[PDB]
Amino acid sequence: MNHYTRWLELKEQARDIAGLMNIREAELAFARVTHDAWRMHGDIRDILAALESVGETKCICRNEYAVHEQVGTFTNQHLNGHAGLILNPRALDLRLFLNQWASVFHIKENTARGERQSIQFFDHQGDALLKVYATDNTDMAAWSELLARFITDENTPLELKVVQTRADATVVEQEWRAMTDVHQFFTLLKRHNLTRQQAFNLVADDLACKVSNSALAQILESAQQDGNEIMVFVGNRGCVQIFTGVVEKVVPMKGWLNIFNPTFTLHLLEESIAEAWVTRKPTSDGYVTSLELFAHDGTQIAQLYGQRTEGDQEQAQWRKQIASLIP
Template sequence: MKSTYQHYLALKSENPRRYARDLATMMAISEAELAHIRIGYDAKPMKKDFVALLQALHTVGETKSIVRNEYAVHEQVGRYDNVKLSNHTGLILNPRALDQRIFMRQWASAFLLKEDTHHGERQSIQIFDTHGDSVLKIYAIEKTNITAWNEIIAQFTLESISNFSVTPVGKTLLNTAFDAEKVEEEWRAMTDVHQFFKLLNNHNITRQQAFASVSNKLASKVENTALSRLLDMIQKDQNEIMIFIGNRGCVQIFTGVVEQFIPKGGWLNIFNADFTMHLMENKITETWITRKPTKEGYVTSLELFAEDGTQIAQLYGQRTEGNLEQQRWRNQIESLLVQDQVA
């Protein structure tokens, strides 16, 4: 274990700008396995009482929560208030602040990590799924109540753990024999966007399969530059939008206006006071505009996918449930279709 930790330190020294996720990849292990290697040095394992942990975090005030997948990072400063959890799913429900959807069946391990930076010690609680991939990282920041934070750390950390392991990600077999006409029929009969998950499960298909199988009225494919052009419009128009970025275990949602939109070095970046997004534009291989019916009319989204099928991000116009969709958002989406709709 020590020699592996020394290997990690050497890689970190040689690659000071690389994140733990990158270093783990260089070591041919998962990020959770790297955290496990660091136990006894700058990491401690934590109890798997995830419900109690999230409920306790309301005492610490503001933290920075980072949710990411392979291609996009969503960082939000906020408080763990309005926590609504079961043993399997949950909500952190603070629109325009910390807003998360939790899928706790996927949560498998958690660690406290301490790292020395130019600004002093940086502490974080990091949660991983059964495959060793990051689900959620919660960082103490200047506004965090560090006394309350330390009390939570004392309550939930362990000195060691046994039987730690991760499982490889299995290959998903696609259902190619589904009834496309039935998919369209059920799609058009929806009265709530959340019913779309049931539709996918009923037919055992992916989002992309569903989009490709229905008429253009419901789903239209556009150029992969659409996100950049849309964010530029949104930043200029200052209308509120919603950005969903997630992974197997957590989705984090931003709601608000885009203060700064900066494309740079293949990344699309948003810099707001309490929200930051980084998304790899050159990894977008499919972009879809979708329209899902609700009791208040159609709700329109922009959905982005990578070559491996990962949903990179999903965007909506800000809408309070029970209200019509924002007309400015519809106009912006329509302008993308007019510019470059593809067959």
């Protein structure tokens, strides 16, 4: 593997360096297995369940255009089904689609004035799913034991990446109006072989309306003044991380739009957005309004909602702030 050698060489000063090498990130993690990395084996669910023993951590979930970072703990877990979850709203709140979780590695992210530990999971395609970094509040005694339990010498090479579908028309709009949970929207897409944007450009405006690409900047400046609680969702093909809370500082910088909160950080490439959309999805409690951002390739950079839990309706403040984009 000229991979490790080239890696060092390239080390600009991994998702990027792997890119330049035209290799997946999991292959670059694979090539560091005896250097600053070690492969881990075992039930993915066992690993997650044990992360609870460790205390505070910094969880980074992201896609090609945005990175969601949340400090918190792997408490209140529920992972016996196909989609597991870590339910800690105002803090660590994640939804995991397990059949996409393939490999796990321990890595010491090259730091300057020292080192940085973390546990990283990758998809079957070789793309990062989730990265859990230890912080100054992490119990390294438990972290050490968790590592001793799952570390392995195997390190076998990595791998790769069904539903019936019906005609379209506008049964899509009736199927849309029949949902009782926003996650049912995916099955609808799957059931008709449609992209989110294809479905949006098929339904009425009251269900989906395209707005200015400055909708995000507009929404979080309103959230900042009004001070009401909002929800930010960022995800990839195998994981989704959610922030619920008040927005403190919104600081933009040459293409990037940042959110700096005491326990949450958002870095979003405000420049890769090619389309923004306001959608209204049905829920067992009423319609929920959210803002959705899309990159040129159709990737969903992120989506925003007003703070809300099951059996609860979206606050009027958010409704007001959002309705002001589709008068």
